[PDB]
Design a protein around this nucleic acid. Structure first.
Ligand SMILES: [Zn+2]
Length: 271
DNA sequence: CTCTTTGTTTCTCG
DNA sequence: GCGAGAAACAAAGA
């Protein structure tokens, strides 16, 4: 998932598990707990979930007064709230059991991670990750963004995917943002002029906030969190190879850019 | 059978 | 430091 999908999960879990005491924790794939599964089980069993926050694509469970469980869902991670008698599904890896249900994490590709750290370690953790600002008008300063683009020869799509200029874009929304802002994904960032950088800055905020409002993009339907979103109905280029651009009618093309499938309009996004 | 592709991140190699 | 390529892993399609 990308930031809008993680935010959607965050909001739905916040409604439902805040206040819940963790009765037990079980793992069939303990190695995805990078700080140690038995250590996490000992520390969090019996504690109450107080909140769920997010930073970029990372979920942050706030558990007890002093613990933060930082969860990254990577490519395929999925949470669901299940009954206590729910049967195991093949790629379920971890569960937190409550008195009246359980929170199960599944991940086909086993890429997602859990790390238990203390409250005062959370900001240093994300500083060490070099995560850029949240994609809001308040936090995403166009002036610094512009200065970073001016001094780089990186291509704009891979630079945006780094999470360092701004947090939260992945392959779907980077393609969507660059189409909206009329910028080719291979454009070297030091060639962007000020008005293009302004449109790109605003398009990043607008696309991601719209996707949040619409509950994320469901490219397939799944029996887990979140509830089926509506943003997939608004995608203009991602996965639309061979369909016509809604602005100019040219066929959307797909190329490979720094190892990633890349969807763009060749008319609207001039090389 | 092989090869490619996939919402992410982070590594080695030269 | 850089970019290219690949790894972690599983499943599906050509
Ligand atoms: Zn077009």
């Amino acid at each position: 998932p990308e930031l809008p999908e993680v935010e959607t999960v965050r909001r739905e879990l916040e409604k439902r598990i805040v206040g819940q005491k963790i009765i037990s924790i079980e793992a069939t794939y303990p190695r995805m707990v990078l700080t140690g599964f038995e250590q996490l089980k000992k520390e969090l069993t019996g504690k109450t979930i107080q909140g769920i926050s997010r930073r970029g694509k990372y979920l942050i469970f706030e558990i007890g007064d002093d613990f933060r469980l930082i969860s990254h869902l990577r490519m395929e991670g999925k949470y669901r709230l299940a009954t206590l008698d729910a049967p195991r599904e093949k790629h379920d890896h971890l569960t937190m059991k409550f008195a009246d249900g359980q929170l199960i994490y599944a991940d086909v590709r086993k890429f997602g991670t859990w790390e238990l750290i203390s409250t005062d370690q959370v900001l240093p953790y994300f500083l060490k990750k070099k995560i850029g600002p949240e994609p809001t008008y308040e936090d995403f300063d166009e002036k610094l963004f512009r200065e970073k683009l001016r001094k780089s020869t990186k291509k704009i799509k891979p630079y945006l995917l780094e999470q360092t200029l701004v947090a939260g874009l992945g392959n779907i929304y980077v393609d969507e943002v660059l189409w909206l802002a009329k910028i080719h994904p291979e454009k070297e960032t030091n060639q962007l002029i000020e008005s293009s950088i302004h449109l790109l800055h605003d398009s990043i905020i607008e696309i991601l906030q719209k996707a949040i409002k619409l509950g994320g993009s469901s490219i397939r339907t799944y029996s887990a969190l979140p509830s089926t979103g509506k943003m997939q109905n608004e995608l203009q280029v991602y996965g639309k190879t061979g369909e016509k651009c809604s602005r100019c009618g040219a066929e959307i093309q797909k190329i490979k850019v720094a190892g990633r499938g890349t969807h763009f309009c060749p008319v609207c996004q001039q090389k």
